[PDB]
Amino acid sequence: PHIGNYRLLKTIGKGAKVKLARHILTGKEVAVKIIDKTQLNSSSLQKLFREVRIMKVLNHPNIVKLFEVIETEKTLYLVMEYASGGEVFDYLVAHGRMKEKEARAKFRQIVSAVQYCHQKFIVHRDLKAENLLLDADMNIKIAGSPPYAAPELFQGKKYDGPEVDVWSLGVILYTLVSGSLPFDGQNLKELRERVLRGKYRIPFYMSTDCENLLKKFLILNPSKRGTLEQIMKDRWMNVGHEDDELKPYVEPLPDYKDPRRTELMVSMGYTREEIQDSLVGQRYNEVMATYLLLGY
Amino acid sequence: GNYRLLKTIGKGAKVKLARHILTGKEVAVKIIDKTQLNSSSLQKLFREVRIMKVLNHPNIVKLFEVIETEKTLYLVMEYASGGEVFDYLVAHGRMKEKEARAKFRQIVSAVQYCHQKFIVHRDLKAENLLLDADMNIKIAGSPPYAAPELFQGKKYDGPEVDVWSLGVILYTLVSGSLPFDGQNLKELRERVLRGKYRIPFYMSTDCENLLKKFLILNPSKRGTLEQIMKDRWMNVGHEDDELKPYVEPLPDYKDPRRTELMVSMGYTREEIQDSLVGQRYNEVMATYLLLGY
């Protein structure tokens, strides 16, 4: 069922297909987005190319790593890290609310990841529980949307900046510890009325710290919103981590010269030469893909 | 109660398809556990019930019975055995304009009727539009239908809301797609707010001209459905038969055919009248109505 070096196995998403697959050369499992470009309107094509630019650049243990991009005139393939544990939504529906200790663990990962995005002036602009995935080890991997929307969407304000993500993150925290959305309703006009006033139900079991942290995210006025760096200093964020406070993620420097992997690739028939070129050039080709994939 | 429950057919509140034991008629019963409904769900359930009781149009689903217990409310209603109009679009592709028109005159009629009684549906969708055995409309997710004023934080209360929505419904009926899309709400909003939309190459100029009467950004500059009823596209194929506001037929609570049958069933002429005039939607009312087929 071959494209590049990948044995396709089950589909796992449709609507653009997502196939789970084996990298022939390393035997590693990965997910392959298959995208029919011939079917995409102009601004979908925009958002696709953008997504791709961003994919290429983020390197955080809780954002899904991109491995390979195979472009053809009609079809684009995005080969990427596969989160076996599925959505966080699912897990909530499944086991109900998270105890605060667990929400915190997931949530540190979440805030870290989005802060990292921000360092690179990337805003996710549309976060949801449908975007938060889980690996084998219950780690977050970042990959419908009304109840996440910031107030400014319903005031026709500009909806451009980082503070959009901050509001979002408030909703996510709230869902993570309560098992439900802080602003709901059976229709858009209710939903909006509720988002705009900004009040939300405080569940009786919720710790006061938790509620204090919510108040740092869900502030109505955009320009009065914390940065994620500031929020990163919050007490609830840090309970259980008295020594390793959440600080902005620092990504580690590239290493395109790993002898372990280079040797293995040379066997495979790759040249030290191209291996270098592809890595330095950040080509995301079969050579880059392989090197990265052997990192596992 | 008086009903044999058959296939379930919705959950999330359940809907069971059932047969009225005494008439053998198929009905759908919404079963609702009130004990799990929070406050404003409860307010809405009560509102939907008020409205249900009062609308009597051949393209809104009839209420037949309301059975109240402390914990559980059941709503007995007409069952649209043709499914969602959405499903049918996804199934058959777009509608030819002639068919769109046939469905759409029923829809506009339905909603216009609603307005005559000062009800605004406030939230129309294609998930709200069903079909019966004979592919007739029976009125029963939501962001692409939302009017501009939703994103302007402007007040969102009046019938002109429905008029915008109708536009969107018209458009998806004949194009098989929504006029304002996007993969996120920031997009969708920018689009709804500009107000411009793709005109498919096959669309008639008449059709497009009707769209123009619906999808008018400024709320207070929007037609009433009575005026729109007068439009050309609406009336193509109906030159004798211009659509007009539906006139409710006059209360008929004394049909002797049904009254007799109900007397033997052990019902008194008395209660039969009370239940009907009083619009009680109790078992007696249910039965009388259901005997009407």
Swiss-Prot record, chain A:
The active site is at residue 126. Disulfide bonds: none annotated. Autophosphorylated. Phosphorylation at Ser-145 by GSK3-beta (GSK3B) inhibits the kinase activity. Phosphorylation by CaMK1 promotes activity and is required to promote neurite outgrowth. Residues 256-295 form the UBA domain. The modification Phosphothreonine is found at residues 11, 208, 227. It comes from the Eukaryota. Changing residue 33 to A: Loss of kinase activity. Signal peptide: none annotated. ATP binds at residues 12-18, 33. It is found in: Cell membrane; Lateral cell membrane; Cytoplasm, Cytoskeleton; Cytoplasm. The modification Phosphoserine is found at residues 42-44, 145, 207. Residues 6-237 form the Protein kinase domain. Serine/threonine-protein kinase. Involved in cell polarity and microtubule dynamics regulation. Phosphorylates CRTC2/TORC2, DCX, HDAC7, KIF13B, MAP2, MAP4 and RAB11FIP2. Phosphorylates the microtubule-associated protein MAPT/TAU. Plays a key role in cell polarity by phosphorylating the microtubule-associated proteins MAP2, MAP4 and MAPT/TAU at KXGS motifs, causing detachment from microtubules, and their disassembly. Regulates epithelial cell polarity by phosphorylating RAB11FIP2. The KA1 domain mediates binding to phospholipids and targeting to membranes. Belongs to the protein kinase superfamily. CAMK Ser/Thr protein kinase family. SNF1 subfamily. Homodimer. Interacts with MTCL1; the interaction is direct and increases MARK2 microtubule-binding ability. Interacts with PAK5; leading to inhibit the protein kinase activity. Interacts with MAPT/TAU. Interacts with YWHAB, YWHAG and YWHAQ. This is Serine/threonine-protein kinase MARK2. It comes from Rattus norvegicus. The chain holds residues 48 to 363 of 722 of the full protein.
